[PDB]
Amino acid sequence: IVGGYTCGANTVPYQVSLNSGYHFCGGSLINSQWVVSAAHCYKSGIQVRLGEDNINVVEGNEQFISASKSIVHPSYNSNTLNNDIMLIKLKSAASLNSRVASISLPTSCASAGTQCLISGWGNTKSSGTSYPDVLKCLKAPILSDSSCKSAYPGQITSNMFCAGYLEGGKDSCQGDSGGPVVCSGKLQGIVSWGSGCAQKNKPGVYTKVCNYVSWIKQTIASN
Numbered sequence: 001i002v003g004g005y006t007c008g009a010n011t012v013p014y015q016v017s018l019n020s021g022y023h024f025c026g027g028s029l030i031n032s033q034w035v036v037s038a039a040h041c042y043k044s045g046i047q048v049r050l051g052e053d054n055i056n057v058v059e060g061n062e063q064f065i066s067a068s069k070s071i072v073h074p075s076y077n078s079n080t081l082n083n084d085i086m087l088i089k090l091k092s093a094a095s096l097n098s099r100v101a102s103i104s105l106p107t108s109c110a111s112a113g114t115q116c117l118i119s120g121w122g123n124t125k126s127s128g129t130s131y132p133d134v135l136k137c138l139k140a141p142i143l144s145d146s147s148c149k150s151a152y153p154g155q156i157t158s159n160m161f162c163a164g165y166l167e168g169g170k171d172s173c174q175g176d177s178g179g180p181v182v183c184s185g186k187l188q189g190i191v192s193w194g195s196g197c198a199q200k201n202k203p204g205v206y207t208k209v210c211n212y213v214s215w216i217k218q219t220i221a222s223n
């Protein structure tokens, strides 16, 4: 997250870190057994880390649970990033409490102008590299479809939305991949892509979660 703020420990209780020896992606806990992330975060040997603030220090509220299965969306295209969404099932159920909690799926899609919270352990620099230990947060509005398409001609599908600031300076970034965009207490987006980070007229692009609620529910119901 570039141009954000320190969230505060366990203040984003649905935020997970995906770890394969090191943090490599975020994700969102959606029930005691399942995490939503980006398809571009797929790899084998994932350990889901819940209750994290400082990802380098065991602070006492963590739960570390290995994935039993990952399910990349059947229509994910890694070239275009269309349908950039994955489900990860935990080998055992997380213990839910104030600091480890699931986030609601949307009942309807969120409109341009809606204020959201984006979070992660990604790069905090737009030129250069600095990776934080503690969770970073950014408040950002959803942008209009027309402005999103103007920023990224030929690249925005019906399964994507832009959020952030056309002026630059505030954005998600590398390492935030797969993490949440939460608006009015609903998971509306997944950190997906963008050209660089926090660049003028190059806002963040996010997977449009509301398009996937049926798939998520029926996948969970049978897996």
Ligand SMILES: Cc1ccc(C(=N)N)cc1F
Residues within 6 Å of the ligand: 171, 172, 173, 174, 175, 176, 177, 178, 191, 192, 193, 194, 195, 196, 197, 198, 203, 204, 205
């Ligand atoms: C992998 C990646 C690329 C760009 C952005 C962004 N500028 N929002 C975020 C990301 F997670």
Ligand SMILES: [Ca+2]
Residues within 6 Å of the ligand: 052, 053, 054, 055, 056, 057, 058, 059, 062
């Ligand atoms: Ca920790």
